[PDB]
Paper text:
The microtubule-based motor kinesin-8B is required for development of the flagellated Plasmodium male gamete, and its absence completely blocks parasite transmission. To understand the molecular basis of kinesin-8B’s essential role, we characterised the in vitro properties of kinesin-8B motor domains from P. berghei and P. falciparum. Both motors drive ATP-dependent microtubule gliding, but also catalyse ATP-dependent microtubule depolymerisation. All the reconstructions show that Pbkinesin-8B-MD and Pfkinesin-8B-MD contact a single tubulin dimer in the MT lattice, with motor binding centred on the intradimer tubulin dimer interface. The interaction between Plasmodium kinesin-8Bs and α- and β-tubulin is centred on helix-α4.
Author numbering:
A (entry chain H): 1 to 44, 47 to 360, 369 to 436
B (entry chain K): 1 to 347
């Protein structure tokens, strides 16, 4: 009961997905072969949420891997945990998208997509009651953004009543990796606005800050960064996988955190986060976790929560904890930091608690905030788009893939509207 | 510059023979043109209830039409000036509203029979326009679309299937691939629309044999130019828009069909979106402190209607209710919505 379907689109998305799978298999006591070697019966009770049971006491991720390039697939298959995936669930093209949203959405991606659709239909049929979909990808390139968006549109058309979740790695302001990133982000964000029910805005710059400042990590690799994201992902759906004292799944979270249809862009966070040295000089207690989570410098989106207000915040706690203590701490934070919370939604905080902690830790926390500061992310992007579009820079490539200028105009308008709406509700 | 103007009227249907045969009591009384009272049929057994007298539930309107009102009377005393606004180069919008089964389609649009005010709207439009045509050539174009599960059906020409909305240079809204018929008479547009009704998604629900599952949106464009076609012209394209709002639904207790539950939710959501858009437009028109974005984005209905709703336009909400206590709850909710559509405490 309550099966989730996982989709990974483009290189980054795939990489994050791999990490996610690795963590979750470890959590549920699943080895690199698909066999259960755990101790606790609780690890297998709700195994069906993320895994299909294959013949001969093995488990396989309900995961679809998508890319316009084959190399990524190979890299995944050769990775630790690569062999756990169903071979028929790898759907790859041969060409690539060349950082072009149009190639991913209209051309190469279009050709690819039917196969993916066929796979995912089968995966849906297999599951007794699919609660919904989780897509991991980025907005800045061509595949994850254009192809991903296309896929999402198709999915929603066939499953309009199911929950649609995306973990979207967004382009940061300073660390600009590509030149057409503004275009790709703009086009994809628009589509996300209409077709996702909740969107987790993850930002590389913020991750780097976390790694450098909070973990004090000498050399971050993408794997390390990805780990953080994976942890966050695991946090959200802990209530579907384990028992607890107060239980909240994907739907319950959405209903409590989304007051208006369009405002479904979250700034996620995780706690605790310490170095090796600073491990000894700390208190493993709920007050400390709470303190950590609400800090601006612990957000995985490059936005200052102190530049806006929290519309709603959901906190998900894992480990053996006193409910009273949890409640006290959340009330204290809202009373003390009154100015950071919208005053016309009393009790801006939703709490959920799962008894099963993550491995290595006795207590852990996951944060989901709907903050009006997310407007900053959109605004910058809009500005950059304007700067490009005013001089029609790089437009020709997109137009060569069948895209028309008017779409760009529309998307930009839409994003502007969204920004305005956030501002006004602040 | 939101200068939004919306009149709110309501038509009380005459109590039907079926309602009389079923013992219906008269919950609806009209005290004035400006107001209607719905007599909530409480048993009043408690002293508190007898003291409060909650039975007298008042709602605020510009013109409440009683049980004897006809299609011609609704036209003459409500949309008549909206037609004029279009003739004069402005946009205007009419919204039919009520619980499904309320008779919205027949009062406003018709379906071969019961011409509705839509016939009357076009009948005067074309008489005035044909006269004006002597100096200013007119092209009265007509489209008819279906807004269903946020997708748009071309009703006049179903071969375009389900369409999206796009922003124009100068950001008005166009439905892609919609058929536009240039007409000269009400007979042409009325038959065109009634034929188009054949392509609407409708189902035999418990509350209504013909319950619309969608918002039927008429877009009649009164395009004009001085007949001196070789001269530069500041032409007009006033749009006379009429919306058959999907009926409100709370029949999901028995409508357990997957699609009816989907449609129901989308209908109610978009009816509420319209409500929120209206509240915002009214607040801005009033000049309140609520300076913000009008949430036209909340539905395809409102995104499209933005072009008339946010400007120097005349709009009208025409609700449909019943005097019978047997449907008190539907009349109550219908009146409540309409009251909130107006947002004026004159009653
Ligand atoms: N947080 C992470 N970000 C990544 C990772 N790999 C790439 N990226 C970021 O994503 C962007 C590059 O995206 P992709 O390689 O996924 C583009 P994709 O392969 O999906 O389509 P193509 O345009 O066909 O290459 C850029 O901002 C990178 O800095 C990762 O492992 N973690
Ligand atoms: N006294 C007490 N209250 C509880 C307990 N568990 C949850 N609550 C309270 O119950 C309310 C939340 O409702 P739940 O019972 O968890 O929700 P539910 O009935 O399962 O409804 P859904 O999960 O929304 O389907 C809150 O006021 C909690 O504080 C408990 O063990 N004891
Ligand atoms: Mg790639
Ligand atoms: Mg419950």
């Amino acid at each position: 009961m309550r099966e989730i379907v996982h989709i990974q689109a483009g290189q980054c998305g795939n990489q994050i997905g791999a990490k996610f799978w690795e963590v979750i298999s470890d959590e549920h006591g699943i080895d690199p072969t698909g066999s259960y070697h755990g101790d606790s019966d609780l690890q297998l009770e709700r195994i069906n949420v993320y895994y299909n049971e294959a013949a001969g006491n093995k488990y396989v991720p309900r995961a679809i891997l998508v890319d316009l390039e084959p190399g990524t697939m190979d890299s995944v298959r050769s990775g630790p945990f690569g062999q756990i995936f169903r071979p028929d669930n790898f759907v790859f093209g041969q060409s690539g998208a060349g950082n072009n949203w149009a190639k991913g959405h209209y051309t190469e991606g279009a050709e690819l997509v039917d196969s993916v659709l066929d796979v995912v239909r089968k995966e849906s049929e297999s599951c007794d009651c699919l609660q919904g979909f989780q897509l991991t990808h980025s907005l800045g390139g061509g595949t994850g953004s254009g192809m991903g968006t296309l896929l999402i549109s198709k999915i929603r058309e066939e499953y309009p009543d199911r929950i649609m979740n995306t973990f979207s790695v967004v382009p940061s302001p300073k660390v600009s990796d590509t030149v057409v990133e503004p275009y790709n982000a703009t086009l994809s964000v628009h589509q996300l606005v209409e077709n996702t029910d909740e969107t987790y805005c993850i930002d590389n710059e913020a991750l780097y800050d976390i790694c450098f400042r909070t973990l004090k990590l000498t050399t971050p690799t993408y794997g390390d960064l990805n780990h953080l994201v994976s942890a966050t992902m695991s946090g959200v759906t802990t209530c579907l996988r384990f028992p607890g004292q107060l239980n909240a799944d994907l739907r319950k979270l959405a209903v409590n955190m989304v007051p208006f249809p369009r405002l479904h862009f979250f700034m996620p966070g995780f706690a605790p986060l310490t170095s090796r040295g600073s491990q000894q000089y700390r208190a493993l207690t709920v007050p400390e976790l709470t303190q950590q989570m609400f800090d601006a410098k612990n957000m995985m989106a490059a936005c200052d929560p102190r530049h806006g207000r929290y519309l709603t915040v959901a906190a998900v706690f894992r480990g053996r904890m006193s409910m009273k203590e949890v409640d006290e701490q959340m009330l204290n934070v809202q009373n003390k930091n009154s100015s950071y919370f919208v005053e016309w939604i009393p009790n801006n905080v939703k709490t959920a608690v799962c008894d099963i902690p993550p491995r290595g830790l006795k207590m852990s926390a996951t944060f989901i905030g709907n903050s009006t500061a997310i407007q900053e992310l959109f605004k910058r992007i809009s500005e950059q788009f304007t700067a490009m579009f005013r001089r029609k820079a790089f437009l020709h490539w997109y137009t060569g893939e069948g895209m028309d200028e008017m779409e760009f105009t529309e998307a930009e308008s839409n994003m502007n509207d969204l920004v305005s709406e956030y501002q006004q509700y602040q | 510059d939101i200068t939004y103007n919306m009149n709110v009227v309501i038509r009380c249907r005459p109590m039907s023979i079926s309602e009389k045969n079923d013992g219906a009591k008269n919950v609806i009384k009209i005290l004035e043109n400006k107001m209607v009272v719905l007599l909530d049929p409480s048993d009043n057994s408690d002293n508190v209830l007898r003291q409060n007298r909650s039975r007298e539930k008042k709602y605020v309107f510009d013109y409440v039409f009683d049980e004897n009102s006809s299609q011609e009377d609704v036209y003459n005393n409500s949309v008549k000036c909206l037609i004029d606004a279009v003739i004069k180069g402005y946009n205007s919008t009419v919204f039919a509203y009520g619980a499904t089964g309320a008779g919205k389609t027949h009062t406003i649009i018709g379906y071969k029979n019961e011409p509705g005010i839509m016939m009357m709207i076009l009948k005067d439009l074309f008489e005035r326009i044909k006269m004006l045509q002597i100096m200013n050539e007119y092209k009265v174009k007509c489209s008819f679309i279906e807004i269903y599960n946020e997708n748009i059906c071309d009703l006049l020409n179903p071969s375009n299937e389900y369409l999206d909305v796009r922003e124009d240079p100068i950001k008005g809204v166009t439905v892609s691939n919609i058929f536009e018929v240039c007409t000269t008479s009400v007979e042409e547009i009325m038959e065109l629309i009634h034929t188009g009704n054949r392509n609407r998604t409708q189902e035999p629900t418990d509350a209504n044999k013909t319950s619309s599952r969608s918002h039927g949106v008429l877009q009649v464009i009164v395009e004009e130019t001085e007949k001196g076609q070789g001269v530069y012209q500041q032409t007009k394209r006033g749009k006379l828009c009429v919306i058959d709002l999907a009926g409100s639904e709370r029949a999901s207790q028995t409508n357990n069909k997957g699609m009816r539950m989907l449609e129901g939710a989308n209908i109610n959501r978009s009816l509420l979106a319209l409500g929120n858009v209206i509240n915002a437009l009214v607040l801005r028109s009033k000049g309140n402190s609520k300076s913000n974005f009008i949430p036209f984005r909340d539905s395809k209905l409102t995104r499209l209607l933005k072009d008339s709703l946010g400007g120097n336009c005349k709009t009208v909400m025409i609700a449909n209710i019943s005097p019978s206590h047997l449907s008190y709850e539907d009349t109550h909710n219908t009146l409540k919505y309409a009251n909130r559509a107006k947002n004026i405490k004159n009653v």
